[PDB]
Amino acid sequence: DIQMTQSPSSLSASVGDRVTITCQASQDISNYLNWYQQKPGKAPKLLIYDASNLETGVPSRFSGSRSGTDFTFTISSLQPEDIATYYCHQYDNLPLTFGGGTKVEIK
Amino acid sequence: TQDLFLPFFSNVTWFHNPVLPFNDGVYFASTEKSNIIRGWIFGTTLDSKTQSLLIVNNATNVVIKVCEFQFCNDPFLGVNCTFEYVSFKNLREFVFKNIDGYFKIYSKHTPINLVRDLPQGFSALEPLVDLPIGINITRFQTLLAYYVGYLQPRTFLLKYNENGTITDAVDCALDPLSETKCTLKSFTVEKGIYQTSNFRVQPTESIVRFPNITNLCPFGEVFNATRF
Amino acid sequence: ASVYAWNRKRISNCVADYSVLYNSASFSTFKCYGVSPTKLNDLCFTNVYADSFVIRGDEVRQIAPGQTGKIADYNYKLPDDFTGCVIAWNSNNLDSKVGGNYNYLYRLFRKSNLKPFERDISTEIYQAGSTPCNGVEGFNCYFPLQSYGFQPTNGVGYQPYRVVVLSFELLHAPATVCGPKKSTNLVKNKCVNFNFNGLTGTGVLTESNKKFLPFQQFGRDIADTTDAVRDPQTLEILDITPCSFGGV
Amino acid sequence: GNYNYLYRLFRKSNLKPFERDISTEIYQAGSTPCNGVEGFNCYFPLQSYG
Amino acid sequence: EVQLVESGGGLVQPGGSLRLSCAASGFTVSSNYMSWVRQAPGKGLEWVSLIYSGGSTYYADSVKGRFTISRHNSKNTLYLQMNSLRAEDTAVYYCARIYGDYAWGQGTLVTV
Ligand SMILES: *[C@@H]1O[C@H](CO)[C@@H](O)[C@H](O)[C@H]1NC(C)=O
Ligand SMILES: *[C@@H]1O[C@H](CO)[C@@H](O)[C@H](O)[C@H]1NC(C)=O
Ligand SMILES: *[C@@H]1O[C@H](CO)[C@@H](O)[C@H](O)[C@H]1NC(C)=O
Ligand SMILES: *[C@@H]1O[C@H](CO)[C@@H](O)[C@H](O)[C@H]1NC(C)=O
Ligand SMILES: *[C@@H]1O[C@H](CO)[C@@H](O)[C@H](O)[C@H]1NC(C)=O
Ligand SMILES: *[C@@H]1O[C@H](CO)[C@@H](O)[C@H](O)[C@H]1NC(C)=O
Ligand SMILES: *[C@@H]1O[C@H](CO)[C@@H](O)[C@H](O)[C@H]1NC(C)=O
Ligand SMILES: *[C@@H]1O[C@H](CO)[C@@H](O)[C@H](O)[C@H]1NC(C)=O
């Protein structure tokens, strides 16, 4: 199975702060990575597909920037309604891998 | 040996581009003075429906193709593909047969000075090219005087010289003297009485006799029974 | 060529030596279906098809009879009764570029699986719902071709692989392609076990004074036995003298 | 999958009648010796039924 | 217009069997890649299985020989049949779309 671990496990930031997380992959994926936002009590929601394109209906404040094998998420302005669990899931490889999750809270 | 050989003293059609059948194998005889006849077409429909043979010598090289060509109503020469190869004073004889997907072509060239009739004599046609076509052929046509023959599975006795060429032949189904020659395996036979074949009167009609019964056997009672 | 637009090459009317393909050590995958990897030089076929395409390392195993997959369903399907050999090797040094190579495309969305040996090159916008696309991409309207994006730093499963598929088909029609068996040097004046194009036998091969016709290969005596033969390589007529034998 | 039952997968020649071969020597499919190491042209002679 | 609804969850003893349903509206199930994705409480999200548009089926390494996916043509409902449930299979199951967009049902609870 492909090895994939998210970093960091959890963090806290204020409203409008700059939040940067990383997604680490042991095997190199070219561009096949998606980002998801799991609200508490709600299903995850796709924001970035193919790690470089914006899904329709998603605000522009969410972006994915490739950094070689690893891929980094970008948050321009954090809001209290953005409290969710962050996942990166590599695709085109079976089994499909969903990460442990990254929790971002509002301090 | 027994193979497709043209029967001796048989009728061959004399021409001066019709489509003719390819029933068992066709012998082609052509007399040339200015290179009129250029090639041949072999196939079944020859109307861009299936694979057909196109052998054309366009004045510099002999070209053989097996493509599904779209031919004209009257093809002539002025003054999916699987295979492709690029190479009265005279008589050119040809034999075309297609056995087990092998198209055998035999030919022989000789000079002549008689144009009134095909020359009377003996000559053997050697094979030059063999075609692995695997294609059924039922009709043909000639692309441009010439003669068209037909080949029949008749037994022949072939005379071989010291050089291995065929100098004479005997048609075993022509006349009883040739039957004697074929039975004795000698071109010259001695005087006497010999047994060569057996005479059988062939039947002329076919009679099928069955009783006239309108009642059908009850197979529906057995095969379609409710309870077994 | 791309995997969705794989090219087909017809091979016929030539001699093929399959021994140099096995004894090359440059191919990562060498498996034959129906026939053995060896003994390919003794087989004859009417025609041979050569299909070539570029895929990633993970999709190499998908080209096999009885197997499924994206490539097997929507890009290239083999029949269950397929016979032949599949050639594949790594091609990261030739098909990968810095920043991603988009020249190679793959078909992903299709209504039904492909029938074996089907080539689909349609660029119609795929309708994923009850709403027609009318040639406009958007919701429930996805383009059927996507970019591989090969990179030289990609992993083993993500590296591009060049795959060549050999198809062996037979028919009653004469075999146009055949393999060359090794021909040992001719030896003369010895009791040897010989074999030629059409016949085998045991005898002594001596030089003859016979004059064969240019098309003839075999000679026969009176009582339907072979007395002379033509060598398939050198135009020399060789008599077959039977080896010395007799009762004791 | 029951992997205890095995069958011989490669051999150079066919067996004689009532011949029992239990060798586990690595099959050499080429001109390169295997030296007991599996790999290219070097296959284990036994295959599991599963 | 477009919404995925799930049903069939409940409390199942170990060694039992259950069948879930995922009815779709606004699109065609058979022309798109479907998947069943579960999530055990207290841990991350876990993929289980997918089905192709042509009918090809695959499953995760933990569910070989136990899980079965199917689809009824007329009512356009996606199903997941499971057999011999274990204690670690207690998770909240979802039905989703693999590519071009992500569509998620409301979720159902399966407790073993
Ligand atoms: C065909 O040959 C026969 C000899 O068997 C002959 O009697 C007949 O007249 C010939 N027909 C034509 C049209 O030449
Ligand atoms: C004869 O016809 C063939 C058609 O296949 C062509 O390829 C060839 O060049 C022609 N040769 C001449 C001398 O016109
Ligand atoms: C060639 O043969 C194939 C057989 O599958 C056929 O589909 C195709 O239409 C043929 N091409 C032509 C030009 O007749
Ligand atoms: C030629 O005709 C025979 C008739 O029995 C048929 O079986 C065969 O398939 C035909 N050849 C081709 C190439 O179709
Ligand atoms: C055989 O050919 C030679 C010339 O090569 C000739 O002199 C001789 O007469 C020929 N013999 C026969 C029987 O044709
Ligand atoms: C068959 O035909 C004969 C006369 O040819 C007739 O007498 C007889 O009745 C017929 N059989 C039946 C069953 O009618
Ligand atoms: C039995 O019935 C079927 C259906 O009508 C019919 O096709 C079949 O011929 C019948 N069997 C016999 C022996 O008549
Ligand atoms: C084979 O090659 C030799 C020289 O290498 C040549 O003399 C000979 O004629 C060739 N035979 C054929 C059949 O091409």
* Secondary structure of A71-96 in HEC code, one letter for each residue: EEEEECCCCHHHCCEEEEEECCCCCC
Q: Could you tell me the sign of the dihedral formed by the alpha carbons of C96, C97, C103, C106, in that order?
A: positive
Which residues contact residue E9 at a Cβ distance below 8 angstroms, ignoring those fewer than 6 apart?
E20, E93, E108, E109, E110
Side-chain-side CA neighbours of B211 within 13 Å: the count stands at: 4
HSE, side-chain direction, 13 A CA sphere, residue E34:
28
Other Cβ atoms less than 10 A from the Cβ of C34: the count is 11
User: Which residue has the least CA distance to atom 4 on ligand 5?
Assistant: B163
CA separation, residue D48 to residues B195, D2, D15 (Å)? 73, 9, 20
Q: Give kind and range of the element (H or E) at residue B142.
A: strand B139-143
Between the alpha carbon of residue C211 and those of residues B4, B162, C186, C189, E6, the distances in Å are 27, 9, 20, 20, 91
Report, in angstroms and rounded to the nearest whole number, the Rg of chain E calculated over CA atoms. 13
Q: Which ligand 3 atom lies nearest to the CA of residue B48?
A: 14
Cα distance from N-terminal residue to C-terminal residue, chain D: 5
Q: What is the spatial distance between Cα A6 and Cα A22, in angstroms, rounded to a whole number?
A: 7
Tokens of B59: 């004045």
How far apart are the CA of B225 and the centre of ligand 7, in A?
10
- Tokens representing A43 are 């299903």
The 10 Å Cβ neighbour count of residue C43 is: 16
Judge: C58–A68 Cβ closer than 8 Å, yes or no.
no
8-state DSSP, B215 = S
| Atom number, ligand 4, closest to the C-alpha of residue B136 | 1
Joined together, the tokens standing for residue C81 give 């009764």
- Ligand 3 atom closest to residue B80's alpha carbon, by position in its atom list: 1
CA–CA separation, E37 vs E42, rounded Å?
A: 16
> Which of A38, A43, A98 is facing E46, going by the closest CB pair?
A98
Residue B117 burial (CB < 10 Å; 0-12/13-18/19+)? exposed
Tokens 């996507």, residue located: C146
Please report where in the chains the tokens 């087909």 appear, as a residue. Answer: C8
Residues forming a β-bridge with A45? A37
Q: B68 CB less than 6 Å from ligand 3?
A: yes
CA of B167 to the centre of ligand 5 (A): 12
> Which residue from C81, C105, C220 is spatially nearest to C160, judged by alpha carbons?
C105
Helix (H) or strand (E) holding A21: strand A19-25
Contacts of A29 in chain C (CB under 8 A): 158
The CATH number fitting domain B1-200, selected from 1.10.10.1150, 2.60.40.1180, 1.20.210.10, 2.60.120.960: 2.60.120.960
State how far the Cα of B26 lies from the Cα of E11, in Å rounded to an integer.
86
**CA B220 to centroid of ligand 7, rounded, Å:** 6
Binding-site residues, ligand 7, Cβ < 6 A: B 219-220, 223-224
Distance (Å) from the C-alpha of residue C71 to the closest C-alpha of chain E? 12
Which ligand number lies closest to the CA of residue B162?
Answer: 5
H-helix or E-strand containing B178?
helix B176-184
Amino acid letter, E84: S
E strand or H helix that includes residue A63: strand A62-67
Q: Is C239 on the interface with A (CB under 8 A)?
A: no
Neighbour-count burial of C27, counting CB atoms closer than 10 A to its CB (0-12 exposed, 13-18 middle, 19+ buried): middle
Which residue carries 């001596």 as its tokens? C206
Partner residue opposite E102 with nearest CB, options A46, A95, A99? A46
This structure was determined by cryo-EM
Q: For residues B211 and B48, is the Cβ–Cβ distance under 8 A?
A: no
Residues in a beta bridge with C89? C162
Q: CA angle at residue B154 from B151 to B156, to 5 degrees? A: 110
> Ligand 7: distance of its center to the CA of D50 in Å?
48
Report how far ligand 6's centroid is from the alpha carbon of B206 (Å).
Answer: 21
* Interface touch D40/C23, C-beta < 8 Å: no
Amino acid sitting at position C49: Y
The verdict on whether omega for the bond into residue A95 sits within 30 degrees of 0, i.e. cis, is yes
Under 8 Å between Cβ of B31 and B117: no
For residue D29, list chain C residues with Cβ-Cβ distance below 8 A. 37-38
Q: Write a three-state SS string for chain C.
A: CCCCCCEEEEECCEECCCHHHHCCCCCCEEEEECCCCCCCCCCEECEEEEEEEEEECCCCCCCCCCCCCHHHHHHCCCCCCCCEEEEEEECHHHHCCCCCECCCEEECCCCCCCCCCCCCCCCCCEECCCCCCCCCCECCEECCEEECCECCCCCCCCCEEEEEEEEEECCCCCCCEECCCCCCCCCCCCEEEEECCCCEEEEEEEECCCCCCCCCCECCCCCCCCCEEECCCCCCEEEEECCCCCCC
- When scoring C140, C141, C142, C147 by the number of chain E Cβ atoms within 10 A, the one with the most, hence best to mutate, is C140
Strands A10-13 and A102-106: parallel
Q: Which has the closest alpha carbon to B26: B41, B9, B47, B48?
A: B41
Ligand nearest the Cα atom of residue B59: 2
Q: How far apart are CA A40 and CA A38, in angstroms?
A: 6
From the CB coordinates, do chains E and C have 3 or more pairs under 8 Å? yes
Ligand nearest to the CA of C235: 8
B221 Cα–ligand 7 center, Å? 10
The CA-atom distances, in angstroms, between B99 and each of B136, B148, C172 are 9, 19, 11
Among candidate residues B152, B2, B143, the one with its CA nearest the CA of residue B78: B143
Cα B104 to ligand 5 centre (Å): 27
Please give the sequence-ordered ranges of beta strands (E in DSSP) within E1-112, or none if there are none. Answer: 5-7, 17-23, 34-39, 46-51, 57-59, 67-72, 77-83, 91-97, 108-110
**Residue among E22, E39, E45 with most chain A CBs within 10 A, to mutate:** E45
Question: How close does chain D come to C6, measured CA to CA in Å?
Answer: 29
Residue showing tokens 């994926």: A29
Inspect the interface and report whether the beta carbons of C37 and D30 lie closer than 8 Å: no
Burial of E6 (0-12, 13-18, 19+ CB in 10 A): buried
| Contact in structure between B112 and B88 (CB atoms under 8 Å) | yes
d(CA C227, CA C210): 10
The breaks in chain A (C to N more than 2.5 Å) occur after none
Give dist(CA C203, CA C193) in Å, integer: 7
Relative to the alpha carbon of B98, which ligand is closest? 4
With b meaning 16 or more CB within 10 Å and e meaning fewer, what string describes B47-84? eeeebbbbbbbeeeeeebbbeebebeeebeeeeeebbe
Asked if residue C192 lies in contact with residue C232, where contact means CB atoms within 8 angstroms, the answer is no
Instruction: Tell me the three state secondary structure of residue B176.
Output: helix
Q: Do the chains B and C touch each other, judged by at least 3 C-beta pairs below 8 angstroms?
A: yes
Answer yes or no: is the C-beta of B136 below 6 A from any ligand 4 atom: yes
Q: From atom 12 of ligand 3, which residue's Cα is the shortest distance away?
A: B80
Contact C125, C141 (CB under 8 A): yes
Taking CB atoms and an 8 Å cutoff, what residues of chain E touch A96? Answer: 35, 47, 50
User: Which numbered ligand comes closest to the C-alpha of B217?
Assistant: 7
Domain ranges of chain B: 1-200
Q: Which residues line ligand 2 (CB under 6 A)?
A: B 56, 58, 60-61, 63, 65
Neighbours of C25 (CB within 10 A): 10
Alpha-carbon distance of B70 to B72, in angstroms, equals: 7
Closest CA to C101 of C52, C150, C164, C61: C150
Peptide linkage before A8 cis (omega within 30 of 0): yes
| Count of other CB atoms within 10 angstroms of residue C205 | 20
Count of C-beta atoms within a 10 Å radius of residue C45: 20
Pair of tokens at residue C227: 């007395």
| E4 CB burial (10 A radius; 0-12, 13-18, 19+) | buried
User: How many Å from the N-terminal Cα to the C-terminal Cα in chain E?
Assistant: 34
Compute the residue count for chain D. Answer: 50
Beta bridge partner(s), residue B159? B168
Tell me, in angstroms, the distance from the centre of ligand 4 to residue C16's CA: 28
**Chain C residue with the nearest C-alpha to that of A57:** C139
- C88 Cα: distance to centroid of ligand 3 (angstroms): 30
Min distance A26 CA to chain C CA atoms (Å) = 9
Both tokens of A32, joined, read: 């096949």
Using an 8 Å CB-CB cutoff, list chain A residues near E47: 89, 95-98
Check: CB of residue E17 under 8 Å from CB of residue E8: no
Specify the pairing of strand B102-111 against strand B146-148.
unpaired
Question: Looking at beta carbons, which residues of chain A come within 8 Å of E61?
Answer: 1, 95
Pocket test for ligand 5, best of B122, B159, B163, B167 (most atoms within 8 A of CB): B163
C125, C120, C40, C56: which is closest to C92 by C-alpha? C56
CA distance B198 to E24: 87
Sequence letter at residue C5:
A
Substitution target from A92, A94, A96, A97 for chain C, most C beta carbons within 10 A: A92
Is the Cβ–Cβ distance between C201 and C220 less than 8 Å? no
Instruction: State which amino acid sits at residue B80.
Output: N
Rounded-to-integer distance, Cα E103 and Cα A66, Å: 25
Cβ contact, residue pair A30, C157, below 8 Å? no
Q: How many residues does chain B have?
A: 228
Q: How far is CA C180 from CA C17, C42, C167, in A?
A: 7, 7, 19
List Cα–Cα distances, C48 to B114, C85, C175, C197, E3, in angstroms. Answer: 51, 11, 10, 23, 52
Q: Whose CA is nearest to atom 14 of ligand 7?
A: B220
Pairwise CB contact (< 8 Å): C176 & B100: no
The answer to whether the Cβ–Cβ distance between C23 and D29 falls below 8 Å is no
Question: For residues C87 and C51, what is the distance between their CA atoms, to the nearest angstrom?
Answer: 10
Closest CA to E23 of E1, E6, E2: E6
CB-CB neighbors (< 8 A) of A34 in chain E:
102
Residues of D in contact with C25 (CB under 8 A): 40
Do C161 and C3 form a contact (C-beta atoms < 8 A)? no
